[PDB]
Design a protein around this ligand. Sequence first.
Ligand SMILES: Clc1cc2cc(c1)-c1cnn3ccc(nc13)NCCOCCO2
Length: 291
Amino acid sequence: VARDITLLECVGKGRYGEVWRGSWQGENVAVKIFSSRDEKSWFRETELYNTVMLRHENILGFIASDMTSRHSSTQLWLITHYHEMGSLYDYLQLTTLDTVSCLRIVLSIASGLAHLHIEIFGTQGKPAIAHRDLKSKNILVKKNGQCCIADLGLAVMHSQLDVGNNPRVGTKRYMAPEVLDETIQVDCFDSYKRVDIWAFGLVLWEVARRMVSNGIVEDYKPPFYDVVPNDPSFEDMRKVVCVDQQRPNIPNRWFSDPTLTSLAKLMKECWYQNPSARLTALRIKKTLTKI
Ligand SMILES: Clc1cc2cc(c1)-c1cnn3ccc(nc13)NCCOCCO2
């Protein structure tokens, strides 16, 4: 139960709500406290965790979920494993990477996303799932160096089409061109997997910037830092991604490193204007395993 949790420190704050480091039987756990405005995101992630027994080493580990609702008060809690190392967004602010740690991180993300995307049949199976709000701030760094994906509140599902009634929409900075120009095929499940692949390519660019090659590294920057203001509007991102068709700049240093060059090619194959030309999660994972 949540009754035996002591909230210790607020480790994250946003429009979704807050994330706290909590204590439970003397062990650290994370508690996501949703704002009442995000009730549908809490329920989606709960049914994904407790009805679809969704478990994978690169998906945030679910412990429990609780809601209490009364006149003048509503609480919505998600209790998960705590990762002291924090969000990949925070982690990349402080850390530089080498060849092994860079590929451990990005391969672990690819592995979790493929696990979301690929359907499993039978008993103890799972539908195909699209995240729809992947970004560096919803990926956590585990002690072993791998990552795990969090925030499945916007997931859509499909078996041989489940879209929520969720009024919240993805982070604008990471929205795919088909989302921004509204040509996305809403009734086609593969559209949502390809919106995920787009966002993954941006996360791939974020990680690669922090890997050192030949004694050079870039500071952390978000996708499109140079052409969009902080907290960009829908219109800001359409002008950049669709009209101007701009994409993240690839610094010259990378082409001197074989690994960073391989990731540059992978990045671009996530960024096609045409969603159908983008790689699949499984192909990305199969490539990273060989690289
Ligand atoms: Cl249910 C959930 C959502 C989530 C992050 C966590 C849990 C989570 C788990 N351990 N942990 C450690 C630090 C931290 N978050 C977490 N820092 C705030 C980043 O918040 C991103 C929101 O996504």
